[PDB]
Design an enzyme around this catalytic site. Sequence first.
Site, short mmCIF file in Angstrom:
data_model
loop_
_atom_site.label_atom_id
_atom_site.label_comp_id
_atom_site.label_asym_id
_atom_site.label_seq_id
_atom_site.Cartn_x
_atom_site.Cartn_y
_atom_site.Cartn_z
N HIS B 97 3.03 -2.17 12.74
CA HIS B 97 3.67 -2.97 11.73
C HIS B 97 4.69 -2.15 10.97
CE1 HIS B 97 0.21 -1.09 9.84
NE2 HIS B 97 0.67 -1.38 8.64
N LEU B 98 5.78 -2.83 10.63
CA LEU B 98 6.89 -2.23 9.91
C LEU B 98 7.00 -2.74 8.50
CD1 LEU B 98 10.08 -0.87 10.17
CD2 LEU B 98 10.57 -3.35 10.02
#
Lengths: 111, 111
Positions: B97-98
């Site tokens: 996840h960013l």
Amino acid sequence: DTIFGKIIRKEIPAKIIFEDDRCLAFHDISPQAPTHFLVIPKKHISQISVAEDDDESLLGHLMIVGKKCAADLGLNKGYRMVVNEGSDGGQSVYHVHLHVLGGRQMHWPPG
Amino acid sequence: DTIFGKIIRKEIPAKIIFEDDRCLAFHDISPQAPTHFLVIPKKHISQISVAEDDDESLLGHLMIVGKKCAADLGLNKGYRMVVNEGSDGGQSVYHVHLHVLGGRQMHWPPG
């Protein structure tokens, strides 16, 4: 050019961890953790905000290079990948560069 | 899988920002800045250190989408992008996840 261009041009010395036709990973001279380096595109993109959709595979490439060098650096306990956009991001150099920090516990929030 | 899985599955609510066929952007439940939302891959890559060299355009695609959402969300004064790897990296959920953080000045070091 910045200092980045001169470094890629090997005009000036960097602690080069890695290089390929697309990027240069060299150690961050003002490290914020035991191990700190930057993975930057040889191609000039001032900021992520202006990266084109075709710039896509390079961005992920910087990401993969980052994950490879970090393992190369024995960063088996973890690390934090960063890109800072503009003023609030605290973007110092207006050439896209991916920070990689490790060697210690990073905290929340990320600054 | 993780809560990120069930989120992708629409099993549990989420403040969704954008979706396409390979990824999902939505607000972080525990925001660390006025704007703190995430970009995650529908394909369950547990973490960046494991990402296939085939996930390169995908990982770039995350960043692309991210900066787009930051722009649609009005983040014209900058922001910061983050990828936490492992314990040292302080990776909360084991599914790539960013983070994208803005609305406020981000500090150095980044955690």
